[PDB]
Enzyme design. Structure first.
Site, PDB file in Angstrom:
ATOM      1  N   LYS A  89       0.840  -1.192   0.000  1.00 36.21           N
ATOM      2  CA  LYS A  89       0.000   0.000   0.000  1.00 36.21           C
ATOM      3  C   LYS A  89       0.878   1.246   0.000  1.00 36.21           C
ATOM      4  O   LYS A  89       2.095   1.154   0.172  1.00 36.21           O
ATOM      5  CB  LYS A  89      -0.912   0.007   1.228  1.00 36.21           C
ATOM      6  CG  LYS A  89      -1.667  -1.294   1.461  1.00 36.21           C
ATOM      7  CD  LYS A  89      -2.663  -1.574   0.347  1.00 36.21           C
ATOM      8  CE  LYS A  89      -3.774  -0.535   0.313  1.00 36.21           C
ATOM      9  NZ  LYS A  89      -4.789  -0.845  -0.733  1.00 36.21           N
ATOM     10  N   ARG A  98      -0.475   2.778 -11.538  1.00 34.24           N
ATOM     11  CA  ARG A  98       0.508   3.810 -11.843  1.00 34.24           C
ATOM     12  C   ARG A  98       0.182   4.510 -13.162  1.00 34.24           C
ATOM     13  O   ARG A  98      -0.551   3.968 -13.990  1.00 34.24           O
ATOM     14  CB  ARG A  98       1.922   3.224 -11.854  1.00 34.24           C
ATOM     15  CG  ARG A  98       2.489   2.984 -10.460  1.00 34.24           C
ATOM     16  CD  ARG A  98       3.898   2.422 -10.519  1.00 34.24           C
ATOM     17  NE  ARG A  98       4.466   2.231  -9.188  1.00 34.24           N
ATOM     18  CZ  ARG A  98       4.218   1.178  -8.417  1.00 34.24           C
ATOM     19  NH1 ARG A  98       3.403   0.223  -8.842  1.00 34.24           N
ATOM     20  NH2 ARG A  98       4.779   1.082  -7.219  1.00 34.24           N
ATOM     21  N   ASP A 100      14.295   0.584  -3.386  1.00 30.78           N
ATOM     22  CA  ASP A 100      13.024   0.184  -3.967  1.00 30.78           C
ATOM     23  C   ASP A 100      13.302  -0.635  -5.222  1.00 30.78           C
ATOM     24  O   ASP A 100      13.208  -0.127  -6.340  1.00 30.78           O
ATOM     25  CB  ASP A 100      12.160   1.403  -4.296  1.00 30.78           C
ATOM     26  CG  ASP A 100      10.757   1.026  -4.751  1.00 30.78           C
ATOM     27  OD1 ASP A 100      10.621   0.104  -5.585  1.00 30.78           O
ATOM     28  OD2 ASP A 100       9.791   1.651  -4.267  1.00 30.78           O
ATOM     29  N   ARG A 101      13.673  -1.897  -5.010  1.00 27.52           N
ATOM     30  CA  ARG A 101      13.915  -2.873  -6.077  1.00 27.52           C
ATOM     31  C   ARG A 101      15.390  -3.087  -6.415  1.00 27.52           C
ATOM     32  O   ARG A 101      16.232  -2.211  -6.204  1.00 27.52           O
ATOM     33  CB  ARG A 101      13.121  -2.545  -7.343  1.00 27.52           C
ATOM     34  CG  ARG A 101      11.619  -2.673  -7.181  1.00 27.52           C
ATOM     35  CD  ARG A 101      10.923  -2.555  -8.522  1.00 27.52           C
ATOM     36  NE  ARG A 101       9.508  -2.896  -8.429  1.00 27.52           N
ATOM     37  CZ  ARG A 101       9.036  -4.137  -8.470  1.00 27.52           C
ATOM     38  NH1 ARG A 101       9.868  -5.162  -8.598  1.00 27.52           N
ATOM     39  NH2 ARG A 101       7.731  -4.353  -8.380  1.00 27.52           N
ATOM     40  N   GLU A 154      11.393   4.704  -5.712  1.00 27.68           N
ATOM     41  CA  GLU A 154      11.323   4.421  -7.139  1.00 27.68           C
ATOM     42  C   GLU A 154      11.546   5.699  -7.936  1.00 27.68           C
ATOM     43  O   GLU A 154      11.083   6.770  -7.545  1.00 27.68           O
ATOM     44  CB  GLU A 154       9.983   3.783  -7.512  1.00 27.68           C
ATOM     45  CG  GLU A 154       8.802   4.737  -7.482  1.00 27.68           C
ATOM     46  CD  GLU A 154       7.534   4.111  -8.033  1.00 27.68           C
ATOM     47  OE1 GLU A 154       7.543   2.894  -8.319  1.00 27.68           O
ATOM     48  OE2 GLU A 154       6.528   4.835  -8.187  1.00 27.68           O
ATOM     49  N   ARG A 173      -4.162   1.031  -6.666  1.00 25.09           N
ATOM     50  CA  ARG A 173      -2.932   1.813  -6.727  1.00 25.09           C
ATOM     51  C   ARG A 173      -2.253   1.700  -8.090  1.00 25.09           C
ATOM     52  O   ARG A 173      -1.055   1.440  -8.177  1.00 25.09           O
ATOM     53  CB  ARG A 173      -1.970   1.399  -5.607  1.00 25.09           C
ATOM     54  N   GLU A 213      -0.575   2.965 -16.738  1.00 27.63           N
ATOM     55  CA  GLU A 213      -0.737   1.524 -16.551  1.00 27.63           C
ATOM     56  C   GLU A 213      -2.161   1.047 -16.839  1.00 27.63           C
ATOM     57  O   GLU A 213      -3.136   1.742 -16.545  1.00 27.63           O
ATOM     58  CB  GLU A 213      -0.328   1.114 -15.130  1.00 27.63           C
ATOM     59  CG  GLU A 213      -0.493  -0.378 -14.832  1.00 27.63           C
ATOM     60  CD  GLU A 213      -0.163  -0.740 -13.391  1.00 27.63           C
ATOM     61  OE1 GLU A 213       0.105   0.177 -12.587  1.00 27.63           O
ATOM     62  OE2 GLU A 213      -0.173  -1.945 -13.061  1.00 27.63           O
TER      63      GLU A 213
HETATM   64  C1  LIG Z   1      10.424  -2.694 -12.669  1.00 28.96           C
HETATM   65  C2  LIG Z   1       9.316  -2.674 -13.659  1.00 28.96           C
HETATM   66  C3  LIG Z   1       7.974  -2.515 -13.354  1.00 28.96           C
HETATM   67  C4  LIG Z   1       7.563  -2.329 -11.905  1.00 28.96           C
HETATM   68  C5  LIG Z   1       7.903  -0.977 -11.252  1.00 28.96           C
HETATM   69  C6  LIG Z   1       7.355  -0.955  -9.801  1.00 28.96           C
HETATM   70  O1  LIG Z   1       8.250  -0.178  -9.057  1.00 28.96           O
HETATM   71  C7  LIG Z   1       7.196   0.186 -11.970  1.00 28.96           C
HETATM   72  F1  LIG Z   1       5.874  -0.049 -12.058  1.00 28.96           F
HETATM   73  N1  LIG Z   1       7.040  -2.525 -14.389  1.00 28.96           N
HETATM   74  C8  LIG Z   1       5.597  -2.372 -14.150  1.00 28.96           C
HETATM   75  C9  LIG Z   1       7.449  -2.701 -15.780  1.00 28.96           C
HETATM   76  O2  LIG Z   1       6.595  -2.716 -16.658  1.00 28.96           O
HETATM   77  N2  LIG Z   1       8.812  -2.860 -16.067  1.00 28.96           N
HETATM   78  C10 LIG Z   1       9.657  -2.842 -15.040  1.00 28.96           C
HETATM   79  O3  LIG Z   1      10.965  -3.001 -15.319  1.00 28.96           O
END
Ligand SMILES: Cc1c(C[C@H](CO)CF)n(C)c(=O)[nH]c1=O
Ligand SMILES: Cc1c(C[C@H](CO)CF)n(C)c(=O)[nH]c1=O
Lengths: 320, 314
Positions: free
Chosen positions: B17, B177, B117-118, B38, B175, B180
């Site tokens: 969330k 983006r 964040d990733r 991010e 949520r 999207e």
């Molecule tokens: C990392 C990544 C994503 C996920 C990212 C979430 O932080 C952004 F939404 N997504 C949706 C994508 O389409 N390609 C990506 O490489």
């Protein structure tokens, strides 16, 4: 541990790079030197369908206005991924076998000499950058490639080529890859890029700092010479609007990319070969050049045979 | 030298969330912890214009049959470059500072905690692999990315999310983006990829050898069919005699080398934001710390992180 000499023969295509290499390999014993050849087969089939044709066809259509800059950009970026694939993966599996430096200046012969057809930076920097100078790629994309450039291993000896423009134009006009077209504008771009590259290395090795001289931007040889002006190095290319913030400075994300670019080049051993002579001459010229090239130790006794198998399997599969 | 703890919050997007995320922003409030968010701003303006949109629009147009799988592959391959640019750059500049392990756990607290964040494998491996399962990316471009995956440094702790599909669909739909589109197929693919991913690390850590178990895909650890290797039994990667081409076989060697040394931790997202923050705080007592290479490493990192958050963060 037995020593090893890795020699990447790079530079702009069409100067006699391959012939010089093949001739050099033909001098040594069967298994005291091995050639990692151009992976034309991967560009043509394994990785995709006629990647060279796709690349030049795209640039052509863009020039004629048949497609947009955005269209040409997405195709180039993808093609340059395919082009660099064999280069990048070879390095990845090779890295662990590479140890510390041994040296050339007064040092015994290497148990093995590895000769590469090009270095990863060729497909991840030089040509991507040349396409940027042709409006077929973005500075953001190119820098994205730069950040992907693998860590520079010890004893990375790169050989670039020198050849008068006219001599190069004539030589290129005769022999071209399958799917290639005769682009003089592209030749200039790629030639300019490799000129800058050489300078960028010398600049870096002379204590140059792009952050310290960046302000000097507004309006070739390595291993020798004085410290070059930053406007004469690769850094000068990224003075673009897309990368600049309101305050006129680079976004930190692109500034860090330049930090990686410098980190990668400052530890390479760059040399220049004069391709303005007979094939036999070039072979001998490159031969004298290799005398003063940094060697390295391997990490295991069984590394040597492993690398030979690696090189030969590569040649057998992706070789023409 | 002072110790450091790197925590990459990864897994499929849409499980947590915004409150679950803001707590993490409240975590970085103190100076012993920093939260690299991010890089949305880079995705929407810096790197290119509305990247995520271009990704989901391309897939949509592919499905309707307005573009070819070849047309889509090109874009998806390009888009993924932009996506992972902030991750790659951060790694490349951060790497040199990372020293070796420092008797992680059962030892004094870290001088600094770095929460990302990733991880770079999100834009290089997982999502490209999912798009392949979507028919929008070729298995060659994917293994091409795999070859470019940075060498796994010591103390690479990665947290993946756990959550029922129905629960994931709810939170994801609320949520969304910018740009999207709600795609259930893409949700299934990405979930499967990360599922296999966890299975792959265990497989490798328990002594699994893909070259050895490769024959089972055609005829105590997970079955190779339950690992990421199973995806690459693809026709584009095979010679006329069904044999896997060496260049692709080497790319799998790299993959195996990258994933094995990573440390995976699973976060149950099926709870409240406060519950998620706590669980994450629990998992840290089992994550691997490392030493840094220089004294000024700590401030340089903190500085780096906050410059990132301020420039590309929302
Ligand atoms: C990392 C990544 C994503 C996920 C990212 C979430 O932080 C952004 F939404 N997504 C949706 C994508 O389409 N390609 C990506 O490489
Ligand atoms: C490497 C490379 C080249 C040069 C390569 C020479 O072996 C194929 F001629 N070329 C022309 C290109 O357009 N992109 C590239 O990445």
């Amino acid at each position: 541990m037995p020593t090893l000499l890795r020699v990447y023969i790079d530079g702009p295509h069409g100067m006699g790079k391959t012939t010089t290499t093949q001739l050099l390999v033909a001098l040594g014993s069967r298994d005291d030197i091995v050639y990692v050849p151009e992976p034309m087969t991967y560009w043509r089939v394994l990785g995709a369908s006629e990647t060279i044709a796709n690349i030049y066809t795209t640039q052509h259509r863009l020039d004629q206005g048949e497609i947009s800059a955005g269209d040409a950009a997405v195709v180039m970026t993808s093609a340059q991924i395919t082009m660099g694939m064999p280069y990048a993966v070879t390095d990845a599996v090779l890295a662990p076998h590479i140890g510390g430096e041994a040296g050339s200046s007064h040092a015994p012969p290497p148990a093995l000499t590895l000769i590469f057809d090009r270095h990863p930076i060729a497909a991840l920097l030089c040509y991507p950058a040349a396409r940027y100078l042709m409006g077929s790629m973005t500075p953001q994309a190119v820098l994205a490639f730069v950040a992907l450039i693998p860590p520079t291993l010890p004893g990375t000896n790169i050989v670039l080529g020198a050849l008068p423009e006219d001599r190069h134009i004539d030589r290129l006009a005769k022999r071209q890859r399958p799917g290639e077209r005769l682009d003089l504008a592209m030749l200039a771009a790629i030639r300019r890029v490799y000129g800058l590259l050489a300078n960028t290395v010398r600049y870096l090795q002379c204590g140059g700092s792009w952050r310290e001289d960046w302000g000097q931007l507004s309006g070739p040889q390595s291993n020798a010479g004085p410290r070059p002006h930053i406007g004469d190095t690769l850094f000068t290319l990224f003075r673009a609007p897309e990368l600049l913030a309101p305050n006129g400075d680079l976004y930190n994300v692109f500034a860090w990319a330049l930090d990686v670019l410098a980190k990668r080049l400052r530890s390479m051993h760059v040399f220049i070969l004069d391709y303005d002579q007979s094939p036999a001459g070039c072979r001998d010229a490159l031969l004298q050049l290799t005398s003063g090239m940094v060697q390295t130790h391997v990490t295991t006794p069984g590394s040597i045979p492993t690398i030979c198998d690696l090189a030969r399997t590569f040649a057998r599969e992706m070789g023409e």
